[model samples]
Target chain A: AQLKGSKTEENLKYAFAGESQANRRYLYFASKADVEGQNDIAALFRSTAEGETGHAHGHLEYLEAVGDPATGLPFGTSRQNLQSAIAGETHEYTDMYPGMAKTARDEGFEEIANWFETLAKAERSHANRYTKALDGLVD
Target chain B: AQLKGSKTEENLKYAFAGESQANRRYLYFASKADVEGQNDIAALFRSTAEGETGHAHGHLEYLEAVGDPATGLPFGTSRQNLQSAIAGETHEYTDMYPGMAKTARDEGFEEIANWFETLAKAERSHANRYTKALDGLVD
Candidate 1:
């Protein structure tokens, strides 16, 4: 039977969300490498990315979290992509992660809160990098 | 400079979205494995999930499709999760995938269209799985 209303269930949900996001993020990185003519690097990224997917699949299989997998996102040129990234990083640093951290702390999820805070700081760096790249100062 | 109005850009966008969703889905799978005391299996899921994330990140980097990565999904108990899964799979098979396949075909993305059609078939099986699990007749 399903273990409803339990810590394990809640953790599973959170973990599922967390690992899934991580898996996709790497793919994006790998694609960039390919675009930049770093085929070898891209291959590495892809190979590792698949590993992440395997882990995610394992988790979902245990929980049977299977469902429709197709989703969509807006795409644009490099300039536009940088702009979107900057905005995303801004949100993470200024609002999202901070809010998540606060809520986690309030709920006594200290480790999770720390993770949110750490990510917020990292996002700030990412935003800065995008800014540089947009200005043609970095590849 | 901007690489605007190109098929590559459009495809990259689609790829980014697809990979991102796949990454997240696997994480959910990994969590389920953890809950079932399949620690080794969970580790495998997590490791593979990380690889998937790398791929997503690579794609995003190439397209510069930078944006916040925090996504939201409505999750519930096992029974509820199954119900949602059933509904989602139904929508994919009945509406979303068919439309997507048709659009891809019209755009001369035959391979992509085939992917959509194949996924439509897979979604039907997924829906059946959820139904069996919901009825407590299968694990």
Candidate 2:
């Protein structure tokens, strides 16, 4: 099961939107975050930008994989619902991965199962971050 | 589901590694990105690290709740297992979210369903990012 194919471009654009918002948030954190009892938050910001870039890149890869590179920017998906890919990770935290972990256990991907189990918890935390970030946002 | 309760700081250490890798990777991309690209890249890294930090905090929180600050790290649940978290997101792209979207449709929640459908594609993109990052790092 997947989201509608018609909404791919919309989704990508929204994903990019999420990336943009998250990227900005990271910049603020990195600028202020004290990594090692020091004040090199610029470097931290720069590095954090890199992670956002990876997520953005993921959206870009999907763009490349599915639609025309030049025309993929227009169809902006539902901004509130699928705005951020990370949000999806949060949404699927206990719902999807927990079940998947069980399936993996049954399928002999025991290592995969255990890993998912570990991450489902982390994913919950990940969702909490989004919930915090988007507390006032709604569709 | 959280990975801890061991003798080697397995989850904490891996959380650190994942953060480091994500931070470094974001920096690498940010260096080559344009202005918007740079900002976006930085955000993803920072947010993902935040998520990882959340994991680390969860680990510590549980430890603290139990009256210990310096608990032992678990073993065997290395970065390898963490990759499954990335992989599971990939599954959501294919199997889970899309289906949810379908259900949303029958229940007159097209907007909501569409959101999940859109997320399916975005999640696949995230999974691909992990896969691309993992290509050379893993054996």
Candidate 3:
């Protein structure tokens, strides 16, 4: 699994980054679920959010990637949240992961490349799902 | 690429958790690098950490995962930080990812299963690295 040292280093660094963001993202989701009167859904968000933290911690276990956890965005109205969601998913599928995946491939890290590719596809579905959710909220 | 609806949902939820944690982990690493007088390393951590944030946001965009970002575990001195890293990494490798990966596999989530498996290995490496770093600090 170890590639050249530099490549592996970069891969681990980015992998760590990806997992870190995932944990906080779900915490926010859980909070929103609670505010929106979806208590059961909120539980799902919180528990799954912990799963994301697990993955993040999993990656960090290698580099001993260190840092205290910090928050990202403030909570918004559900509609605003959906809009932000739309924006975020759109950017990753359209702008971010493609380049990341391609670069990984070029660097001969096939697994990392696949990871980014999978994320890109998932982001697209996520965008579609958010769009559907937004429609329900707006209408 | 769509699995069963529930399965896909679970995957995304866990995926979200993983990325969120990665983003924060790097930020901590950035801080540690700074304290250790490694400016360039610190910058790498900070910048890539943000990159992880982008991935986390991408996932959140879909579900509108909502909440204010919270902080956990106050930073101590550099040595304490290394000690903390050692502990965290050890737990993930020894106690967390194996169960997670197994569960994911049983659930027929191959990608997630692989993701956890990969993390288990990486975390072990991280613990060793932290142990090495801590050694220089303590003795």
Candidate 4:
């Protein structure tokens, strides 16, 4: 049964949120330690953060909350999710960021204008990652 | 006195990248501990991740690489950055995600379709955060 409206669903949401928050917080702590030259401390924190993301991912999966369906999202089969992600990332790089850059440049904020361009490129890279995964799924 | 083409600029870029990676890795670690029910361990990781993000942000600023004026982004004064961010986020919620949801639904991936919708809503929330900051910038 879909976990919808069940106590289990609620718990899953809570769990996912909890794990997600910890994931972020740990990274921040690691950053502080790294800057302070506390190498060992940073390492431990870094490892812990990655693990938390996995936990969050797991809870989200059980919740059918990784993507959406009713409202719409990460809930699709892996192939479906990959295709959706690739397409979405493609739009981001090709259209959205470029559009934003134009707006910023028109406003004469040369800085943020370029900011959009860089991110636009980054988005393209992200899309490539998704596409690569999609293709690699075959091999 | 833009940091452009300088060794300092390169160093800053390198520094920013390093910190950003640490920020992500540490968060992942925290997720692990939290699931293990090692509360203290999780807390430590969480704290570290956030600090790393701050460090990355700082390096990015020094590098003139935060948003992007050169390619174009986070380089503007805070106000410009806010405006650009709001505009971009608005587009994501209003236009991009909705469009993606439709595509997913059309592909018969009802799950990812709603996944897009959920993220669309989330994007709107992100936009609100940016707009709020833009407004609060004054008083």
Off by over 4 Å in 2: A1-139, B1-56, B60-78
The prediction achieving the highest DockQ against the true structure is 3
How close is every model to the real structure, measured as TM-score? 0.36, 0.30, 0.32, 0.40
lDDT tens digits, residue span A44-135, model 4: 55665565565556555554543432112443344454465466557757986687667656655566557667766865875686576557
TM-score of 3: 0.32
Better of 1 and 4 by lDDT: 4
Error of 4 at B24 (Å): 4.6
Model 3 achieves a DockQ score of 0.11
lDDT (Cα, tens digit) per residue for candidate 1, span B29-125:
3464556555554454465445445545544444443232332222222333345445655775787667766765766556545755765676576
Q: After aligning candidate 3 to the native by TM-score, how far in Å is the CA of A64 from where it should be?
A: 27
Q: Per-residue CA lDDT of candidate 2, range A77-138, in tens?
A: 22221134344455447565576567657655566567658878866765565455445333
10 residues in a row with least lDDT, candidate 2 chain A = A73-82
Winner on TM-score (1 vs 2): 1
DockQ of 2: 0.04
Candidate 4: stretches off by over 4 Å:
A1-139, B1-25, B40-44, B47-51, B63-66, B69-71, B74-76, B106-108, B132-136
lDDT (Cα, tens digit) per residue for candidate 3, span B1-139: 2222333334444545656654565555455556656565456446655655666665444333222122122222344334544565676778667766676566555665687777778668756865764575431
Q: Go through the candidates in order and give the clash count of each.
A: 60, 19, 33, 68
- Shift in Å, residue A17, candidate 4: 18
Question: By the lDDT metric, which is better: model 1 or model 2?
Answer: 1
